[PDB]
Amino acid sequence: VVGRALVVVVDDRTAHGDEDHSGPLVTELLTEAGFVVDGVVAVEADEVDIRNALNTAVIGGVDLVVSVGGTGVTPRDVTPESTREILDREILGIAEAIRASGLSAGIIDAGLSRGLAGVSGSTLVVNLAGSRYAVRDGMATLNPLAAHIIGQLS
Amino acid sequence: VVGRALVVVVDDRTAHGDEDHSGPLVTELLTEAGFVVDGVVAVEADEVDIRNALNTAVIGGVDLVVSVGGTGVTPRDVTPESTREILDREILGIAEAIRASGLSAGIIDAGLSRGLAGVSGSTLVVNLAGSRYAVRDGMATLNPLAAHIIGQLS
Amino acid sequence: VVGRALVVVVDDRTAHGDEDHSGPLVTELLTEAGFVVDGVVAVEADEVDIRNALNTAVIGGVDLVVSVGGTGVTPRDVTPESTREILDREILGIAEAIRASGLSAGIIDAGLSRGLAGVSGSTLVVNLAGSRYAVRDGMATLNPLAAHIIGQLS
Amino acid sequence: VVGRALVVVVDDRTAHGDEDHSGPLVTELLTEAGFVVDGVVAVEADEVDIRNALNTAVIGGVDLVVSVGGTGVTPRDVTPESTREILDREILGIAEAIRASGLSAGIIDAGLSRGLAGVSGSTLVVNLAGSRYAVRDGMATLNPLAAHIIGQLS
Amino acid sequence: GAELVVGRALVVVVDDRTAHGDEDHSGPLVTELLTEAGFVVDGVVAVEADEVDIRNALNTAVIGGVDLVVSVGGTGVTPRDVTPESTREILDREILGIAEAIRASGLSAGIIDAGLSRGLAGVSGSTLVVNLAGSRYAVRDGMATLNPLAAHIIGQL
Amino acid sequence: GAELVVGRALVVVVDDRTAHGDEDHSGPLVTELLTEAGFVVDGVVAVEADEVDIRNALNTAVIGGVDLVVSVGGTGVTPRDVTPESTREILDREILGIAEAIRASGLSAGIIDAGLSRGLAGVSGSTLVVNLAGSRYAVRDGMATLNPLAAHIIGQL
Ligand code: NA
Ligand code: NA
Ligand code: NA
């Protein structure tokens, strides 16, 4: 039992009631890696809402938060800006490894993802890009890294 | 629709009627990549049985065969030795990319997998290691590569 | 036609009217990637001059600016410092991929390049190191990445 | 002055008089790296002709032979089979590095190239894939490797 | 013939128990590896995992004209892991490619403290400073990666 | 407590001048690195760059029940570089991923003899055999890469 994890799905349509294509996948992958998943929170691609969702999880003592979406370059891709405000420190290695793995698998939104990763309070927070391939490959890359960091934070 | 796929699961306990963990996962991932999955064939870790299952798949005209397991180094891991004889041309780039990806993700049985990849008739054949993480990460790496090869073989 | 490109060559000897080696190469490579090259602007290694040349390029609506030189570590390599101020968002994945590629090819000024990559307005801006090998290998790495970003920005 | 080099262009159409799109490029890149280029030989995608062209260059004391084309998976891609017969020993590192670099640059014919590299007599022979991107990225990767091996062979 | 010497180096060991007189396991190793790469090693300085102490040790080396400072330790995520924060303050500019190469190499060798190291690399005055993680494998692998980079940077300076 | 020992190792130094009594620079280093990774080191055996001598040294180790043989040298492209040809003959199967990881790591660290090494890796009976290139940087970097791989292979055997 590695810890507690939360999925934050950053998508306007999903926030407004549409089917969630990312939450169950990330839940399945997190559960497989030994996490108990608190649930999935869906938020608009809005800086205030994203920050509030991340901060709420940190205050709540979650071990791992994985966000999905909002890491591209269109106007509304504000997940990295939001995440930057709430991090006490960055673990660049996590974002580099995820980008490196995405690029060589030809998953372009992962290879170029502006997503961040770091520690806020005692919580590891990681932004993943929104595509299903990005989600699968990012989690594959994250598995050994998250266990190590959470163990150190405990 | 990219083409037709078959899954071969190399495992003694499965071939004797224990629960199959890999077949449904590979099928899920194949279908997601746009393949129609003919089905899953479970085979003992027997050099001849493996080679005949693969050979039956080729003769039957399937576009992609993915095998799972029997690629380590115990006397029983005979998958690469089975597969070698049915291959007309090896595509070393697929096996290398699978291994390099496994290694950076800390997936040791993938990083050290002796699995082959190659063309048999008009069928692309790829051996994956048996761990769940090896299955996931190997399929993520193989996705852009299979599509290209099958396109080239059509 | 993928879009319009500008080349900025950061070099004192060139800005003073010596032969330009990089401009024609970058133009050849840009055109090959499907860009229309507006032209080459030669600038001194002056933090302000560089930043204004880049800024003029952005205001003029060009899709891709590639600069060459001034990304090492002498007091005179001020390209990244110029570029930082005009960037709205950094795309760290481009700079990382350029460096990792340079490093495995033994191209040290590329592997250690302090060059940035990011979005300014609707313009993608990328700093390359100044060696001929750095220009070639950086453009090979950038090709799939620029196309995707400009597509996303349109 | 690193040594003497020969370009072997493996393409049916080019052998039969069509414009050569690869020869001048490889010549330019070889010359840039310090080689004197003997010329370009164009051959059919035929095992006998390819072998004869490679062997002729070896007997002739060429330091480096770069072939271009015939490394894919269609029936007529027989460059690796031809090259295998004439090599005394393989340098797998060259083919791995070229494939690794091609994959992460999204150059699929390079990432999956079945091209070989090795020593025949005192000659380094390297098969590159046929696309212009493959040619450019392969040469970038080959530059430091060829100089090292040729120096050892002397 | 000192003709092929690359320059002067200093090792900074960031470790509390070492700062209080416990046997130093990192200093001699980094010294051996620096010397083998052609650096003349001034010595090893032990400091506590304390931002001011780390910062003072680095400033002294910079003021002293040392070409290469390699620190060892204090690059994880616990609260005492303050080497990067101490280092950032004294850097004039960062050389991202060094830290990226150390991490990428660490990750493929299964050296997790190296793969995740928040250690920085960059230039302060004319001094190259590189933070490595504390485990023995991080030190060894970090130095293997640093060898071809440091010498090039110092040459440029 | 010998509880966490991974297994027994042997070092084979392939070098002509060392085989004829010149100071061995590789044996002690590989021994140090093997011991640090949890291997108990039987010793170092020096042989000439000769196919029969190399092959005999390897066969003796295999017959002896050694878990890991690391050879050093004879992996380039000159005519005396015969370690891979000697090794291929005694291998039951190859573990391509080891040789690929050593080369990829060597290449990014600018260690060209490692990046281009024709050295093999594989299993002979119950013995893992890995050929490394001869330079000091190849030995160090090769071992950093081998550490997480060897222990896993031996466990499986
Ligand atoms: Na991956
Ligand atoms: Na490249
Ligand atoms: Na390494």
> DSSP of F52-69, one letter per residue?
HHHHHHHHHHHHTT-SEE
Encode F25-51: b = buried (16+ Cβ within 10 Å), e = exposed: ebbebbbebbeebebebbebbbbbbbb
Look up residue B17 and give its two tokens. Answer: 């009627």
Phi-psi region of A132 (alpha: psi -120 to 50; beta: other; left: phi over 0): alpha
Look up residue F18 and give its two tokens. Answer: 């060392």
Look up residue F139 and give its two tokens. Answer: 């030995």
Please give the distance, rounded to the nearest whole angstrom, from the Cα atom of residue C137 to the centre of ligand 2: 6
Q: From the list A96, A99, A108, which residue is nearest C148 (CB)?
A: A108
Please give the distance, rounded to the nearest whole angstrom, from the Cα atom of residue F134 to the centre of ligand 3: 16
State the alpha helices, DSSP H only, in F37-123: 51-63, 83-90, 96-108, 112-115
Which residues have their alpha-adjacent CB atom under 5 A from ion ligand 1? A 101; B 101
Could E147 and F109 be called an inter-chain contact, meaning their C-beta atoms sit closer than 8 Å? yes
The neighbouring-strand residues paired with E46 are E13
CA dihedral angle for residue F133, residue D115, residue D66, residue D105, rounded to 10 degrees: -90
d(CA D94, CA D118): 8
The neighbouring-strand residues paired with D36 are D4
Look up residue B153 and give its two tokens. Answer: 């073989």
Please give the distance, rounded to the nearest whole angstrom, from the Cα atom of residue C40 to the centre of ligand 2: 25
Q: How many helices (H) and strands (E) does chain B have?
A: 7, 6
Between chain A and chain B, the number of residue pairs with CB atoms below 8 A apart is: 38
State residue B97 phi and psi, 5-degree precision.
-65, -40
Least Cα distance to D120 among D59, D68, D45 occurs for: D59
Strand ranges for D18-143 from DSSP E: 35-43, 64-68, 89-90, 117-120, 123-128
| DSSP notation for A46-111 | -HHHHHHHHHHHHHTT-SEEEEES--SSSTT--HHHHHHHH-SEE-HHHHHHHHHHHHHTT-HHHH
Tell me which amino acid residue C146 is.
A
d(CA E60, CA B3): 66
d(CA A122, CA D79): 57
B88–D contact, CB cutoff 8 A: no
Look up residue C125 and give its two tokens. Answer: 């801006």
Task: Compare all CA atoms of chain D with the CA of A103 and give the residue at the minimum distance.
Answer: D104
Encode E91-110: b = buried (16+ Cβ within 10 Å), e = exposed: beebbbbbbbbbbbbbbbbb
State residue A93 phi and psi, 5-degree precision.
-55, -35
How far is residue D151 from each of residues D23, D31, D140, D148, E108, measured CA to CA in Å?
Answer: 25, 17, 18, 5, 30
Tell me which amino acid residue D133 is.
Y
Please give the distance, rounded to the nearest whole angstrom, from the Cα atom of residue C99 to the centre of ligand 2: 10
Least Cα distance to E86 among E54, E132, E61, E60 occurs for: E54
- List for chain D the helix, strand, coil content (%; round to 5): 50, 20, 30
- Rounded to 5°, angle at Cα D100 from D99 and D104: 115
For residue A55, give its domain range.
1-154
d(CA A148, CA E78): 12
Look up residue C110 and give its two tokens. Answer: 């590329």
| DSSP notation for E15-61 | -HHHHTT---SSHHHHHHHHHHTTEEEEEEEEE-S-HHHHHHHHHHH
Name every chain F residue with its beta carbon within 8 A of the beta carbon of E101: 108
Q: From the list A100, A105, A143, which residue is nearest B133 (CB)?
A: A143
Look up residue B58 and give its two tokens. Answer: 């080729």
Least Cα distance to C141 among C87, C114, C103 occurs for: C103
d(CA C142, CA C101): 10
d(CA C133, CA B51): 47
Q: From the list D92, D145, D152, which residue is nearest F78 (CB)?
A: D152
Q: What is the DSSP letter of B120?
A: E
Domains contained in chain D, number: 1
D106–A contact, CB cutoff 8 A: yes
C142 to chain A, closest Cα gap in Å: 11
F107–C contact, CB cutoff 8 A: yes
Please give the distance, rounded to the nearest whole angstrom, from the Cα atom of residue D102 to the centre of ligand 2: 6
CB count, 10 Å around CB of A20? 19
Name every chain F residue with its beta carbon within 8 A of the beta carbon of D91: 77, 116, 118
F121 to chain C, closest Cα gap in Å: 23
How far is residue C42 from each of residues C46, C138, D9, E61, E139, measured CA to CA in Å?
Answer: 11, 19, 38, 39, 43
Report the Cα E13 to chain-centroid distance in Å.
Answer: 8
- Which CATH number does the domain housing residue A110 bear? 3.40.980.10
Pairing of strands F127-132, F93-94: unpaired
Residue E30 contacts residue E11 (beta carbons within 8 Å): yes
d(CA B111, CA E111): 15
d(CA B84, CA C80): 51
D117–F contact, CB cutoff 8 A: no
Please give the distance, rounded to the nearest whole angstrom, from the Cα atom of residue A26 to the centre of ligand 3: 32
A97–E contact, CB cutoff 8 A: yes
Task: Compare all CA atoms of chain D with the CA of F103 and give the residue at the minimum distance.
Answer: D93
A92–E contact, CB cutoff 8 A: yes
Pairing of strands F93-94, F121-124: antiparallel
Name every chain C residue with its beta carbon within 8 A of the beta carbon of D149: none
Least Cα distance to E87 among E46, E128, E116 occurs for: E128
The neighbouring-strand residues paired with B42 are B9
| DSSP notation for C46-67 | -HHHHHHHHHHHHHTT-SEEEE
F116–D contact, CB cutoff 8 A: yes
How many CA atoms, within 13 angstroms, populate the side-chain half-sphere of residue E44? 20
Between chain D and chain F, the number of residue pairs with CB atoms below 8 A apart is: 39
d(CA B49, CA E49): 60
Technique employed here was X-ray
The full length of chain D comes to 154
Residue E121 contacts residue E98 (beta carbons within 8 Å): yes
Pairing of strands E7-14, E39-47: parallel
Owner of token pair 């011991």:
F35
Please give the distance, rounded to the nearest whole angstrom, from the Cα atom of residue B101 to the centre of ligand 1: 5
d(CA D26, CA D9): 10
Which residues have their alpha-adjacent CB atom under 5 A from ion ligand 3? E 105; F 105
Between chain C and chain D, the number of residue pairs with CB atoms below 8 A apart is: 38
Q: Tell me, in Å, the resolution of the deposited structure.
A: 2.2
Q: What is the DSSP letter of C20?
A: P
Owner of token pair 């290469």:
E68
Q: From the list E101, E153, E156, which residue is nearest C103 (CB)?
A: E101
